[PDB]
Amino acid sequence: GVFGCTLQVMQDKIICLPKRVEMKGLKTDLDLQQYSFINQMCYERALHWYAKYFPYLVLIHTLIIIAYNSALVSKVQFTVDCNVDIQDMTGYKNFSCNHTMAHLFSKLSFCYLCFV
Amino acid sequence: MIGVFGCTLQVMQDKIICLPKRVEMKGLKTDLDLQQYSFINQMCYERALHWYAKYFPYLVLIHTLVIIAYNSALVSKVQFTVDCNVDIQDMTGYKNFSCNHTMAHLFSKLSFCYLCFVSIYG
Amino acid sequence: AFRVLKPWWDVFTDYLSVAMLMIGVFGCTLQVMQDKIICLPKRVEMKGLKTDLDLQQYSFINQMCYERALHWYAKYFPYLVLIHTLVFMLCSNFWFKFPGSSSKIEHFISILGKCFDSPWTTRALSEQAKALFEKVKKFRLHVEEGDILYAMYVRQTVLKVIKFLIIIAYNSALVSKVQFTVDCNVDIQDMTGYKNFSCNHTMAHLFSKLSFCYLCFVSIYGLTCLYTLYWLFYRSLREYSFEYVRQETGIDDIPDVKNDFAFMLHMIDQYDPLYSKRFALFLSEVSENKLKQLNLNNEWTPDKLRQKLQTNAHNRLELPLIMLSGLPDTVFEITELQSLKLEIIKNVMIPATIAQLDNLQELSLHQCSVKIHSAALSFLKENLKVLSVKFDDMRELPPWMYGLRNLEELYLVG
Amino acid sequence: AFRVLKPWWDVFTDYLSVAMLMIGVFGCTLQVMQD
């Protein structure tokens, strides 16, 4: 769980965009900041707390597992959606997001389950 | 060790993001540069955020060098999101702002583990 | 060298100074890292309020209103803390960094180390320390003229007190001066197009709180000084008289020491009274006499005295002595000797161990000062038959020889 | 050998020299970093 924690603190950053709207560009005319805000919002809300705590959970347990870890590995995925009411804050409601480390833990989690 | 860790990231990433609150769907372009936004970060960080929250990395450090009565009721004080009606009108064109910071949920979970550590010690 | 010289209040002050340095270095580190003012032009449903200024003018305004508006004390506070901490360190360590007194301090620490390390201290309270008694006496005659070390320490404490007073005085007023926000009217209009500005910097409130705790620390430091002030201005430490060792080992000597020695004895007592008790003996005159007797008994031994023996003029097994400073015990272990010869041997005490020399009938005395104890004197009164005595200035002549009732022949010269 | 050769003024000058050296190195650090 130590290795996942290092990636969680440093590398685990989520990127987000608003979903609801020759192919032209799709200028969303929002600057960097509320983009970071939306990153935080859909990081806290949509991202599953087990996944957020997964680097911590392995660290805590290393220092019943099969019953609930089996379902929560399939619970997490690469992409994510979230309908959080940032309307009147940025004017958008439904967002798509993805965080960089999603598939890596999915490969890492499956091998970790075999050990236990 | 917990006290230094909290102070370490507080120097690094204790940053609160802020937006002016009150205003198919489109963008909400605000036409404010990063300068005003850092200014608003400072202002609402000072005003809205609770004092114990800001000094949480320092309260832990001082107590280690030298709890349950007040910190138990102070855990519910820290919130993920937060709001501020700061009189920054005629300064940036807004009055109300919604803000929050990465450390909000981090400290709440960090406080939960620390409150256990003090309990076993006492 | 650096340990037995520190009273508890001194160690507390030293660790307070360490905390001072830590506070200061943390403050200066934060100032160098993240001390940034942020500024905006002041006097301008609600919409945006774009100011059409690129980043560079923003930095320039930051610098300008940081220098002008933000108070100089708010900026310099960590650096002030560093300078005051360093001056405190210097004024604390100057007591030992001045070589003139440092040499005396070094010799003092060394002699007490050798003294409480000496087993003969315990032996006298219940060999080579004899050679250390002269070091003790030379140092004690050396530093009775001083007391300037005490005055220098007092002046150091006074300087600490005065600087404390000034620091607390001005900081009490200047804590309120710092503020989170600030307004500046800088005549930068028509060069950047604005004159009124609102600014605030990250450090401000933090420093306030930091300042507060810092002040508290300084305050307790001052209390330490206050303690020493009582310790300086009520005990009258210019004179030291044991009156305890004199009562516990029954030694009427070691009456007093001068102001410098009084003070250093006091400091040792504050550190460890047991070390003062251990060091007390190397000054006793009677203990010095006992150590002289001990070394004398050790180095003159019974085989040596048996070899020295012979027959005198009056056909008696005699142990002639020509150079001595006392009476060896092994001399009294050879009971078969019948006579004794002494030349230039002063400070002589005859113990009742001469009564061990039961077959004693002649004695030869030549220019020696001899005092007998009452039991030994009675033994000689009931045992002497012949005597030889020589006196130059009537001093070596003993009066007690006028008490021996059984003397037959007395030989005198001079 | 290395101590008894330093009168009081010599030691005080040495301390002043050390203080000046740290002042100078601090100034150079500030110039390279923030100036």
Residue numbers in the entry:
A (entry chain G): 39 to 59, 95 to 136, 275 to 327
B (entry chain A): 37 to 59, 95 to 137, 276 to 331
C (entry chain B): 16 to 59, 95 to 176, 236 to 523
D (entry chain C): 16 to 50
Task: Give the text the authors published on this PDB structure.
They are believed to be essential for maintaining cellular volume, as they are known to open in response to hypotonic stress, enabling efflux of anions and osmolytes, thereby preventing excessive cell swelling and burst. VRACs are hexamers composed of five closely related paralogues of the leucine-rich repeat-containing protein 8 family (termed LRRC8A to E). In contrast, when expressed on its own, the LRRC8C subunit forms a larger, heptameric assembly with weaker mutual subunit interactions and a different preferential arrangement of the LRRDs.
The female patient carried a different monoallelic variant in LRRC8C, NM_032270.4:c.1168 G>C, p.(Val390Leu) (NC_000001.11:g.89713738 G>C [hg38], NC_000001.10:g.90179297 G>C [hg19]), or LRRC8CV390L, which also occurred in a de novo manner. To investigate the biochemical properties of LRRC8C constructs carrying the disease variants, we compared the elution properties of overexpressed and purified WT and mutated human LRRC8C subunits as fusion to green fluorescent protein in HEK293 cells and found LRRC8CWT and LRRC8CV390L to elute as monodisperse peaks at the same volume, indicating that the presence of the point variant did not interfere with folding and oligomerization. Even though less pronounced than in LRRC8Ctrunc, related features in the map of LRRC8CV390L indicate a similarly increased subunit mobility. Akin to the truncated construct, also in case of the missense change, the ESD region is the best-defined part of the structure, obeying C7 symmetry and closely resembling WT.
